[PDB]
Design a protein that fits this description.
Elements: E1 9-11, E2 22-26, H1 31-38, H2 42-47, E3 56-60, H3 66-82, H4 85-98, H5 105-114, H6 119-127, H7 129-144, E4 152-155, E5 159-161, H8 171-186
Parallel strand pairs: 2-3
Antiparallel strand pairs: 1-5, 2-4, 4-5
Amino acid sequence: AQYEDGKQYTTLEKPVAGAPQVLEFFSFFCPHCYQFEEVLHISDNVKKKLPEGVKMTKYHVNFMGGDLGKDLTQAWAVAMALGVEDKVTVPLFEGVQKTQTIRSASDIRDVFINAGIKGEEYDAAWNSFVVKSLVAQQEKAAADVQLRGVPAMFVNGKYQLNPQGMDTSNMDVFVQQYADTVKYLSEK
């Protein structure tokens, strides 16, 4: 077959019921995640080839960067609650991996302030039980599915993208192969 289990994707032994259609996991500490976001624009190119009626979800993980890692998972819950993902993703990646100006929760907060979210609004969000459950959702989803590595994408709680088995000679061709694989898995 042109698409083969173990080649562009793997199958979960232990399928996850009720799982989001396209579920992606990342960390702001994750170097391939940086690439996926700023150079390859994976999420965006997947969206463009997905049918419609299909929801895309993106969650942060705790297992990188210790204490700061958990703060970043809370901050991403804040971002999801406020709908400001698009405004903080780049400054968070660059503040962690490029400029290395993110070293504490207060530094994460600065990124939001500078992106124009108001202090009061951010801190109320940070402390809110709606953010608490959004943190739980991120954790449970990762727990449900094995997760010890990022970047990761899972389709319909059954299939996991295997970018190692795709060619990287041309970044453009890598991305299309990836997105086309998601489309294929989505129609499966």
